[PDB]
């Protein structure tokens, strides 16, 4: 019974962390795309 | 999970910093874009 | 010279549009991969439901409830991947 | 099977990258191709 | 056009519209060469 | 028998490669040949 509970805890913890890491990486990638789409070189164009 | 949660809180703080900064003219430009879309719908009604 | 500065800004913008194309293409792959995951998890949920129907046909309600517990785990995991996918879809449209 | 599944996921990621990139004029060209096909059907009705 | 008339005589409107699409391409190419020819005629008279 | 079956599968693959390649004008030429055969039947009816 301890082994069955241990395997369940390991499996759930591993898969939950893996999908959380994947979604966190996707979320920060989208945030950097929106930030870089905002942060255009408008001051350099204005200086020209 | 606490290290990942600290990186999520850094993305929330980055989103708060962008949200207070990003007050721009572009909202009035989107109202002009919607007016231009209304002109294309009036041209579609004229074609119909 | 202002003409050289604005030409350099346009060159830098060619690098930026390539970086944003990469970020879109990455996000497109993440939404397609999490769709693929929830699609196969729901097909495994059907297999475990049919394993429960076989157990009920044999009268083994114990094995049927155990097989339905695999079905629950898989459909809950597919709902978690659908929730993750919703964040990928909105980010994919934001970058687009 | 996991190495083959990683290559399938690379083809899915490649298909997602093509799907976000491939927004093109060609859809309006296909509407013109269907209009040209309609002209050949009108010429077939004229021949009949 | 005669290939289209043969297709219509056999009832193959699909082949008739395909053959008429070759007719369209050729007559449009002949109109492009007539436009090019008009520039050659005026240049020929200018040099004369 | 497996070596002979591999040569049969090479002839099937060769037949598939020919089948995808061999889209040609000759089908419209066969419709003209059938029309010419119809003219010889009309000349036979005239002789009768």
Swiss-Prot record, chain A:
The subcellular location is: Cell inner membrane
Residues of the whole record sequence present: 120 to 167 of 267
**Recorded phenotype for the gene knockout or disruption:** Essential, it cannot be completely disrupted. Cells with very low levels of protein have no ordered thylakoids, are barely green and are non-photosynthetic.
Taxonomy, superkingdom: Bacteria
The protein, known as: Membrane-associated protein Vipp1
Similarity comment: Belongs to the PspA/Vipp/IM30 family.
Record's function text: Required for thylakoid formation.
Species this protein is from:
Synechocystis sp. (strain ATCC 27184 / PCC 6803 / Kazusa)
UniProtKB/Swiss-Prot annotation, chain C:
The portion of the full protein included here is 24 to 119 of 267
Q: Which residues form a coiled coil?
A: 3-96
Q: What happens when the gene is disrupted?
A: Essential, it cannot be completely disrupted. Cells with very low levels of protein have no ordered thylakoids, are barely green and are non-photosynthetic.
> Which superkingdom?
Bacteria
Q: What is its main location?
A: membrane
Where is the protein localized? Answer: Cell inner membrane
Enumerate the UniProt keywords alphabetically. Answer: Cell inner membrane, Cell membrane, Coiled coil, Membrane
GO CC annotation: plasma membrane
Name it.
Answer: Membrane-associated protein Vipp1
Gene from which the chain derives: vipp1
The family line of this record is: Belongs to the PspA/Vipp/IM30 family.
Query: What is the recorded function of this protein according to its Swiss-Prot or TrEMBL entry?
Result: Required for thylakoid formation.
